[PDB]
A paper describes a structure:
Once inside the cell the terminal glycine is cleaved by a dipeptidase (PepA) to release Cys-3M3SH (2), which is metabolised by a C-S β-lyase liberating volatile 3M3SH (3), which diffuses or is exported out of the cell (4). While the PatB enzymes are poorly characterised and the genes are not associated with amino acid metabolism gene clusters or operons, the orthologues from B. subtilis (PatB) and Escherichia coli (MalY) are known to have cystathionine β-lyase activity, suggesting that these enzymes might also be capable of Cys-3M3SH cleavage. ShPatB and BsPatB are homodimeric with each subunit containing a PLP moiety covalently bound to a conserved lysine residue in the catalytic site (Lys246 and Lys234 in ShPatB and BsPatB, respectively) in what is termed the internal aldimine state. In the course of a typical PLP-DE catalysed reaction, upon substrate binding, the ε-amino group of the amino acid substrate displaces the lysine residue from the PLP to form an external aldimine.
As we were unable to capture reaction intermediates by soaking ShPatB or BsPatB crystals with Cys-3M3SH, we sought insight into the mode of substrate binding by growing crystals of ShPatB in the presence of l-cycloserine (LCS). LCS is a known PLP-DE inhibitor, that forms an external aldimine complex with PLP thereby inhibiting ShPatB. In ShPatB, we infer this arginine to be Arg376; in the structure of the inhibitor complex, it forms a polar interaction with the C=O of LCS and is well-positioned to form a salt-bridge with the Cys-3M3SH adduct. Moreover, substitution of this residue with alanine abolishes activity both in vitro and in vivo (respectively). Tyr25 is part of a sequence divergent N-terminal region, and this residue is found only in malodour producing staphylococci. This N-terminal region is often unresolved in PLP-DE structures, and indeed, we could resolve this region only in the ShPatBLCS structure. To gain insights into this constrained substrate binding site in ShPatB, we examined a unique tyrosine residue (Tyr25) that extends into the active site in each subunit with the phenolic side chain projecting towards the PLP moiety. The PLP adduct of Cys-3M3SH was superimposed onto equivalent atoms of the LCS external aldimine bound to ShPatB so that the α-carboxylate of the substrate forms the conserved ion-pairing interaction with Arg376. In this conformation, the side chain of Cys-3M3SH projects from the deeply recessed PLP binding pocket towards the protein surface. The aliphatic 3M3SH species fits, with minimal steric hindrance, into a spacious apolar pocket formed by the side chains of Tyr25, Val46, Tyr72, Val108, Pro134,Phe274 and Thr276 (where italics denotes a residue from the partner subunit of the dimer).
Numbering used by the authors:
A (entry chain B): -4 to 341, 347 to 398
B (entry chain A): 3 to 26, 41 to 402
Write the structure that this text describes.
Amino acid sequence: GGGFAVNYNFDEIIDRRYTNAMNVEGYKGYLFGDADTSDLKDNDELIRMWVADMDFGTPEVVLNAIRERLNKKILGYTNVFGSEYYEAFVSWTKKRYGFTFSQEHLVFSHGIVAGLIELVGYICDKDDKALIVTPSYGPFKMACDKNHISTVYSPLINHHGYYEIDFDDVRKKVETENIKLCIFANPHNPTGRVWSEEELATLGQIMKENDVWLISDEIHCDIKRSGQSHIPFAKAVPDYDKIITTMSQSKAFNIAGLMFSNIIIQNESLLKTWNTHHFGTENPLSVVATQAAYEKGEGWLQAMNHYLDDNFNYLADFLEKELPHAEFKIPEATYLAWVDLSYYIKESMAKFFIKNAGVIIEGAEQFVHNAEGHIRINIAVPREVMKKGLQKIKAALV
Amino acid sequence: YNFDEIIDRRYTNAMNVEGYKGYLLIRMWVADMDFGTPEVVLNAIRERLNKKILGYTNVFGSEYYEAFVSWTKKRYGFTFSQEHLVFSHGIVAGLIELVGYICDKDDKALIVTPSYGPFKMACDKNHISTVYSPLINHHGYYEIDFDDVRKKVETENIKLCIFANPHNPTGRVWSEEELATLGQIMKENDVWLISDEIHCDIKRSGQSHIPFAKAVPDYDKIITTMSQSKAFNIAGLMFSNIIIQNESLLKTWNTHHFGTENPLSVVATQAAYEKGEGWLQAMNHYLDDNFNYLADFLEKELPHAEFKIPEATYLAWVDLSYYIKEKDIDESMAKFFIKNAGVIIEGAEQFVHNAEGHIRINIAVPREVMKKGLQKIKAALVENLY
Ligand SMILES: Cc1ncc(COP(=O)(O)O)c(C/N=C2\CONC2=O)c1O
Ligand SMILES: Cc1ncc(COP(=O)(O)O)c(C/N=C2\CONC2=O)c1O
């Protein structure tokens, strides 16, 4: 059955020390690069609310699938054979979004950023340009950089944390610049928008009219407030084979470390390129984990989302009371809160909050453009941890 | 340990079982083992699952480095610097990336042949042309043609040599003298060398491994790749070591490399270094006994085949030229043996060049499986021969 009867405990404090977790160990390198961080007090017991992995356990249904695979004793060369994996994945997309795609069109990457890097290389020639809306998940730009593809930004319009696409701006840029590709988060990181069919259709008709490819990164699509629906870009715009879809269970099931992602490529030419040029076999533990999420993970994921919704409600009340000049809207999707602290801001905000709050967040410097004065707070943590972090953030701003 | 155990590989999406009607029944083909990954490794992965979260991971601090370098020191007297250790998702992914950084459009790569095929495919993926130096064959004992290598390096724009130490498919464990001589050629011509040492811990009693960078310590363009994937039967975990001693290339890697690591892959690999030596020694003893049977079997039952016990690997390289000519076999020997023996092997076609007439037999299998496979191979060859 679907996992609805089990009581889960999202309040559980799970120790992440001595696990080589980037969340615990690697904030200085990620946030500050090669810069000197000697001014940071090494012995600060930091509350982690930065990188997008969860402090909630990967559900036992997923972990038990990995255990059963280990019991088969050999961890040799693996690939996705037959149709069982495909059937599990398309069953999920059909059921949840009315989205179907052919088995031939499904290929695999070792995480979605690796997929983006490879895709951009195949799609874009040296003098082609890519468009992103801003603020943006940073690896969308890094994937272009890695391929020597220049990026153009279209800043989203912001009303008090409710963001929308400036279609006039996108259209102008697509028409006047050599834009070959748009990389797009549906739903959006860091703003949390769940795009409507109408928004996606409007963007799709700009892309079709201008022969622009669009990669829809839907990795956050199953993390959303109760009652929200997700519409895949390729469902909203079903008449264009240059929409590529990326989805995984990494975010939803807290298995980013397993590096196994779905890429749906509807363009026969690009698919041939992928098929003949893509190198890599698959990790058996990663594939069994992901398949287990699709087949068995429904109940747990619902419970996780319900708990997150209560965390967002607490956060909203907390900000209203304790930081009334901050601006926040509960996002429609993701476990990431985007908070405008422009009023309180008088060095990078990530450095500020580590030094002055003992809290690790992400700031404007992590989101490319159009992010001034904001932080991103990861609240996929026990409510008690979130409370402690919010208290420290508040103390530092006042 | 019970290396005789028959482990079911069906319903595990294993290439070895599902893929052979695609890469081109008793399975003796692709290089993973039918021996279980050792419990000391599996139990490390189980312990890591008990920590509940499988999030973003990298190699932090020095415990991994300490484990790996203690292994290389103990076993080969080889040490290297922590700063020079980076990671790839398997060695072929690492080769593809390294070739891209090292070589430009009109640089060529050199490989000795016969070769592991992905050495050439790593060059093809980077649009780098490959040049072949055929090894010299003395009745299944292979040697480098130093005259040929010297010529090719001097008279063509060879930027990189990709080298297997020990060698696949011939099994050669190169001597200090061989490595020193080859290294000096490369040093004098300013040629990068990638020494792929993935088979280095699978070797006969009485054979000792010398890393290329140990034999040739004063040339910083020797790159070493090592893994526990072959030795511990964990190729599915896709996690590999690369030792880059050249500061410019290391800077390029650190700036341009993308990827995090799989926590289950890292724990597994670290466990093999920290706890694996006893199982590995036992496995090697059992493999040696498989080779002794194979050598006896071929001498008695297929006397026209040419075969030498390989110094390393679990892979037997067998010249069947005599039989192919006498029978006028006009299909690949992998098709021949699937159809006529019900045995899957790798034919000459998988090994780039200088391979015609040979097959490669994987004998990292229970001894009774190997015996059954060798019986069927022999029967298909001697049918209607005197
Ligand atoms: C839009 C988007 N695409 C792709 C990825 C990568 O997912 P993977 O396949 O690597 O699991 C992320 C991860 N979000 C990152 C992780 O750290 N903070 C973030 O926002 C993301 O937000
Ligand atoms: C010399 C050499 N290098 C690298 C690899 C790749 O190892 P990975 O990092 O992927 O574990 C192999 C695997 N040998 C292959 C595997 O199948 N048949 C063969 O000959 C090999 O022989």
